[PDB]
Amino acid sequence: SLQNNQPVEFNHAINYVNKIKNRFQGQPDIYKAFLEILHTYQKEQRNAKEAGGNYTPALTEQEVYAQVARLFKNQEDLLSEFGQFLPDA
């Protein structure tokens, strides 16, 4: 089951894609790129998760953070905010 008290993924992720959508609303290239990174990273994460460990994920935490870091220059706010999402361990 899911929760309802103190929603982190909801408010955070939603406001994330929202702010970025309204920010680079004129640049669909960089926006599509980022989305493509998380997309491929998602599928690689799911598959690798179902595999166990004998699988070799294509994109890792460093792959995404790097490409994303290259996607933007003067806009580091996105990189930091994104880091907040990056699973802590």
Binding site: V8, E9, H12, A13, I14, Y16, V17, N18, L35, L38, H39, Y41, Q42, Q45, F85, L86, P87, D88, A89
Partner: peptide
């Protein structure tokens, strides 16, 4: 009011968030 990626963006985002400090 709001329109997501209409794909699975909410999933990957929810993954990084939930997995944070988890496991």
């Amino acid at each position: 009011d709001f329109t997501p990626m209409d794909s699975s963006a909410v999933y990957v985002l929810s993954s990084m968030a939930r997995q944070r400090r988890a496991s």
